[PDB]
């Protein structure tokens, strides 16, 4: 219902290698009303939605306010790791 929405900057250059060794999610969103921002995630909040509902869920993203229903495109892995990278979101309405 209420995941972790923490904003980012335009080009955080190669500090993102340290974001691999600390358990962080560099994540995309682009959708219907509000165009595009990069947002933090931490990996222990999807698994309630994952192992409760499945793969066609409704994530209710926040702007620290009213919710935004998304229609998840890719939440993929990296090789040899099993963690969250290149997580292309997508959001169409009800």
């Amino acid at each position: 219902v209420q995941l972790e929405v923490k904003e980012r900057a335009i080009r955080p250059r190669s500090l993102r290698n340290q974001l691999r060794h600390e358990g962080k999610v560099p994540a995309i969103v682009y959708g219907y009303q509000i165009e595009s921002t990069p947002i933090y995630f931490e990996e222990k909040d999807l698994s309630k939605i994952l192992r409760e509902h499945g793969a066609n869920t409704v994530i209710k993203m926040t702007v620290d306010g009213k919710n935004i229903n998304t229609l998840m495109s890719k939440a993929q892995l990296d090789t040899f790791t099993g963690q969250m990278l290149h997580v292309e979101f997508l959001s169409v309405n009800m």
């Binding site: 793969a55 892995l77 990296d78 090789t79 040899f80």
Partner: protein, 141 residues
Amino acid sequence: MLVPKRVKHRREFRGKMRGEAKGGKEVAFGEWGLQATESHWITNRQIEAARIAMTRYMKRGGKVWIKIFPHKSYTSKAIGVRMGKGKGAPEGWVSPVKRGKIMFEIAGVPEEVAREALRLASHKLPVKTKIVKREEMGGES
């Protein structure tokens, strides 16, 4: 000296390659598969030995998937021949495998026989492996 699989030529000698890294290239056929998580050449004969170590635990069913194929060719000179003249006659058909890629896949058999056959395979390949399902899809069906 058993080669299962070859090409049709179009060029004899090829440049010895240079492999660094890969990613993705996941399970798509199946339900149980390896992951070569180093980088090496893998010849013909290793894939024969991997076939047979698969299939002698695949009795009456269960699909075998071979996803890697020897395209390129090595060459070698003789012993007693100096350095010098042109490239020696090609003997062998070897393809590279980087990290990430998947050696073989299985489906149609429960988990225990699957991990048996996959550890029978991975003692015949020079790369450290793992074992990965077709873990999650948008529709697993």
